[PDB]
């Protein structure tokens, strides 16, 4: 259907809008403390204290296959991002510092995005 095709290119268009907040907030990572998934050869109790893994990459996959429905889905895997780590880490680590310093600059780039995603429907 012609309705179907405009639903899809709205996908494609918030993909698109998506795509450069990934970027945005991975910028925010220079140390690429959250580029990839934690390793489970090098932490290998990880899954008995984080139940849902996430990293940048992981998230990227998803974007291209359009698997984000809306922000709203994309938030929730940026923020298991930084929860995961603020948990797993003590604060006195350079792991929990970077998760907080991406929290507080991501807040920026994603309060802009909320806006783009509403104001263009």
Same mark, same amino acid.
């Given at each position: 259907?012609?309705?179907?095709?405009?639903? !899809?290119?709205?996908?494609?268009?918030?993909?698109?809008?998506?795509?450069?907040?990934?970027?945005?907030?991975?910028?925010?990572?220079?140390?690429?403390?959250?580029?990839?998934?934690?390793?489970?050869?090098?932490?290998?109790?990880?899954?008995?204290?984080?139940?849902?893994?996430?990293?940048?990459?992981?998230?990227?996959?998803?974007? !291209?296959?359009?698997?984000?429905? #809306?922000?709203?889905?994309?938030? !929730?895997?940026?923020?298991?991002?930084?929860? #995961?780590?603020?948990?797993? #880490?003590?604060?006195?680590?350079?792991?929990?510092?970077?998760?907080?310093?991406?929290?507080?600059?991501?807040?920026?780039?994603?309060?802009?995005?909320?806006? !783009?995603?509403?104001?263009?429907?």
């Amino acid at each position: 259907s012609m309705e179907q095709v405009a639903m !899809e290119l709205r996908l494609t268009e918030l993909t698109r809008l998506l795509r450069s907040v990934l970027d945005q907030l991975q910028d925010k990572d220079p140390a690429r403390i959250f580029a990839q998934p934690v390793s489970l050869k090098e932490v290998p109790d990880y899954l008995d204290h984080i139940k849902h893994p996430m990293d940048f990459a992981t998230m990227r996959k998803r974007l !291209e296959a359009q698997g984000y429905k #809306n922000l709203h889905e994309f938030e !929730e895997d940026f923020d298991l991002i930084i929860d #995961n780590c603020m948990k797993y #880490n003590a604060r006195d680590t350079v792991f929990y510092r970077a998760a907080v310093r991406l929290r507080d600059q991501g807040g920026v780039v994603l309060r802009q995005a909320r806006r !783009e995603v509403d104001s263009i429907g």
